[PDB]
């Protein structure tokens, strides 16, 4: 017993680019998921295992707080069976995924007049990610054949783009902080519970 440090994930001052997404292992703590689902401040809150009522009543060996920023029209893609720039090249969930996506509009925090260049995403990739792969490679994307020779140019894409979040974009093109809770049962009996 003390209190799981969800505080550190949700109220984080800075948040990760989606290519370079953060994971935070949660172990050896109480929980209290209801602080989460009862916030006001969550625009999105799909669960995919479990009614978030009865996940307060249940115990897991580990919990992971995957946490990045995307644009609002991308938050469609943070789910099972999804497809596009974000699901394919930046953050895939599995088809059998059982946990919770939370997100919320962060236009106040993560925008600037001229653009916030800090957030980025990956535009091209020789194939799609496996579930929960991350790729923080640079490496010039070869869209043609005829090779790149480390020039960026025609058919030769530097494959990480900036979002450039202004506060005068429309809601589809403004930044959303996302947080995926993933829940695994294993051998070594329990670590994270519910009071």
């Amino acid at each position, epitope marked *: 017993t003390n209190l799981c440090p969800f505080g550190e994930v949700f109220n984080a001052t800075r948040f*990760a680019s989606v290519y370079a997404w*953060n*994971r935070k292992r949660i172990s050896n703590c109480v929980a209290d998921y209801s602080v989460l689902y009862n916030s006001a401040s969550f625009s999105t809150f799909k669960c995919y295992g479990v009614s978030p009522t009865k996940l307060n009543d249940l115990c897991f060996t580990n919990v992971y707080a995957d946490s990045f920023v995307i644009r609002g029209d991308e938050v469609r893609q943070i789910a099972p069976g999804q497809t596009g720039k974000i699901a394919d090249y930046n953050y895939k969930l599995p088809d059998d995924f059982t946990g919770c996506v939370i997100a919320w509009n962060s236009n106040n925090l993560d925008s600037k007049v001229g653009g916030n260049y800090n957030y980025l995403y990956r535009l091209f990739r020789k194939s799609n990610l496996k579930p929960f792969e991350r790729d923080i490679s640079t490496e*010039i994307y070869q869209a043609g054949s005829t090779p790149c020779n480390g*020039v*960026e140019g025609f058919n030769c894409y*530097f494959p990480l783009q900036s979002y450039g979040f202004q506060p005068t974009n429309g809601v589809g093109y403004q930044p959303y902080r996302v947080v995926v809770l993933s829940f695994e049962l294993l051998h070594a009996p329990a670590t994270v519970c519910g009071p």
Partner: nanobody
Amino acid sequence: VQLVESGGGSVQAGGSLRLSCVASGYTYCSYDMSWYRQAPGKEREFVSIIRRDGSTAYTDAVKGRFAISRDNAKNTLYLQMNSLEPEDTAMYYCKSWACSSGEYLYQGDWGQGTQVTVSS
């Protein structure tokens, strides 16, 4: 980690300039590094990268006029700009890319930028 650009200024076209970016502060791994530029009113375009394995890429506009170099001894990143045209006028920005070590992950950083300004 706190990047800080320097060098650059007003320069007659066909001259040269050395940009210096100086890292300050630690991190639990070693990261790639880029030059970006943002022209007047155009957005931020990539200029070059250099990676852990010592590979470079350059943007086709600057390929063979411009050269990226690190001195890890002094934690300093170098852009040699030669035979500057007016098109090369821009605010120039150094960027540190990501890396992991273990559970931890480093995001990156941009600097304030410095103004290059190329007449004729």
